[PDB]
Design a protein around this ligand. Structure first.
Ligand code: ZN
Length: 187
């Protein structure tokens, strides 16, 4: 999309006022999406971690790698979103649900930076998809997503709001692995 304004870039970096957060529709995440975890497993993110560790004098390669290893781990390799339906691919199995929007939640992290979770709920009794999902993607108002983090669970939304360590991360399926590492090198 368009380059971010200064205000949108600050929001992407976790700086914004609650009054500037707006609701979003599921279609902001329409598309087919690939988990980045297989890239981590295969060593393709080694240059990303080398770059971050060289730049942060307070962190070692191992500490950076372990952080993203915990962050990215998931067995959901692919997510498809279209026509109000999210489908999850785990090995050779698919589950899906027509998710209902339930608003957003503004979280404030230990650093004082903030982030917004967009909440959805599955109310289809015939579905085996996660009952609760939340999207987080460094965007706080309608805009098509470039990559997203998704929190999935079956117990409650608060349960997912408590999750800070694991944040399965998805880029568009149509990007090459080079192209994904490329985007990650710039973050
Ligand atoms: Zn991110």
């Amino acid at each position: 999309g368009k380059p971010l304004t200064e205000v949108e870039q600050k929001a992407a970096n976790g700086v914004f006022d609650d009054a500037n957060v707006q609701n979003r529709t599921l279609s902001d995440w329409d598309g087919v999406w690939q988990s980045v975890y297989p890239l981590l497993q295969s060593g393709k993110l080694d240059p990303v971690f080398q770059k971050k560790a060289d730049a942060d004098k307070t962190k070692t390669f191992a500490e950076i790698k372990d952080y993203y290893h915990k962050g990215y781990a998931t067995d959901i390799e692919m997510i498809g979103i279209e026509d109000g339906i999210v489908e999850f691919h785990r090995n050779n199995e698919t589950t899906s649900c027509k998710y209902d929007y339930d608003g957003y939640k503004i979280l404030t992290y230990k650093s004082g930076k903030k982030g917004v979770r967009y909440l959805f709920e599955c109310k289809d009794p015939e579905s085996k998809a996660p009952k609760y999902i939340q999207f987080s993607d460094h965007i706080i108002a309608p805009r098509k997503s470039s990559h997203f983090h998704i929190f999935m669970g079956n117990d409650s939304q608060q349960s997912l709001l408590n999750e800070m360590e694991n944040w399965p991360t998805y880029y568009p399926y149509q990007l090459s692995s080079e192209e994904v590492v490329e985007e990650m090198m710039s973050h």
